[PDB]
Request: fold
Amino acid sequence: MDMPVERILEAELAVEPNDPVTNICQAADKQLFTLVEWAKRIPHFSELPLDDQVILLRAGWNELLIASFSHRSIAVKDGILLATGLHVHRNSAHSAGVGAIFDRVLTELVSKMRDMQMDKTELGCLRAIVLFNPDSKGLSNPAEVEALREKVYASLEAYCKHKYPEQPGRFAKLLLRLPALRSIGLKCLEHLFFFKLIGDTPIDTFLMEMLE
Amino acid sequence: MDMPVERILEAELAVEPNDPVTNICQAADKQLFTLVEWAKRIPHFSELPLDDQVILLRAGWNELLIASFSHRSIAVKDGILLATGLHVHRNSAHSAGVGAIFDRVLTELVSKMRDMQMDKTELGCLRAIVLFNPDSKGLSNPAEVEALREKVYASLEAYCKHKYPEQPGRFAKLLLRLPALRSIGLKCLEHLFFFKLIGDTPIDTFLMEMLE
Amino acid sequence: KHKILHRLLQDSS
Amino acid sequence: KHKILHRLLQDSS
Ligand SMILES: O=C(O)Cc1ccc(-c2cc(C(F)(F)F)cc(C(F)(F)F)c2)cc1
Ligand SMILES: O=C(O)Cc1ccc(-c2cc(C(F)(F)F)cc(C(F)(F)F)c2)cc1
Reply:
């Protein structure tokens, strides 16, 4: 195996745990640090040129954090669990004025993750895939990142066929949450740029840097 | 078969052929009509409640038109072929100020379609999938649209395994262009809203309606 | 109401 | 230059 799912899962286990939009942002900034630790535990990531590592996490960070906190919320009803340990409910989200994007996270990601019982090996793999985004502008060698992306989804397909043989379209199912993830990522980014632009909200330094 | 790929392909064949942004918009509006004809030739679409049909095409129309003109451009170098018969080159696109989104279409969709030689049965299937978007807000019965989406990607997986047995990850590959399609769709929509807001550009009535 | 989208979708043919 | 992102990525551990 050039890409064992086993190691992707340890990566996940390794990095593991009052205006709601201030809270979300504190969490985001905190988790940006946990993300860099996670990516380093992903096979071959650390071997890439420092430049491409930077491009990938600058490209992926938003989608990757959304994947984490969505899968972390599967047990939760009508709400998300932040890394801070603090739950945000949809009522709190509508009342800060982020109900639309919030609802989208619940219905398109959390609910779907709960309904199919997406395991942490699968979350890992999807996040690993999002990381190895060959579309990322500026990459020294896109072919290599394509080839790593290829190793991940091959491994996952076999993990699914083996672990959930009853569900022959589980693999496809998993891959068809990445579009929803892409949409929700960009809407979140549009929001974060506004919290910054407006200065309504404290933006801690690493999140700050990801928005510059 | 509850969803034969054969019929999806006939759907495609059935609907088949100076500011560049005026041209693109004329094309878009023209193709909106061709799209409604296409969707009606997709198995089971026409059987849905009129309300859901409307929600799906209002949800999908942007991504579906981008899929069409990208696959239509595979042969073309550094440019797109509009349904109008008129080619737009990246030089024309940068010089109207839409080079960024243009480049994204070339690199993330056209090039990838050319490189893998995505056939029209596959384009059809991906477009069919985009249509059956169970995430679409307001649907009378999302489960049904989920179930139709499921029939399409099952059919496609078997089409790929059968037609391209040499390429066991072709199926995954195809599904991993939908995220790029989702991004480019939203960026295109942000642009079209601006052409409208600014009135720099003629917006024909059906495209007009899709932006209201 | 989406006038045009609705009129294209009703029409047989 | 992405100061913080760069400093986290160099450090072994
Ligand atoms: O605890 C974590 O994993 C980090 C983490 C936690 C939360 C969010 C988040 C961000 C936004 C934003 F930016 F649009 F305001 C919205 C939402 C949500 F829609 F309310 F769910 C959630 C990002 C990252
Ligand atoms: O001929 C067709 O299939 C219809 C059709 C043709 C063209 C575009 C298009 C739209 C935009 C927009 F809206 F951002 F300005 C940009 C671009 C592109 F990036 F230049 F390629 C292409 C949409 C639909």
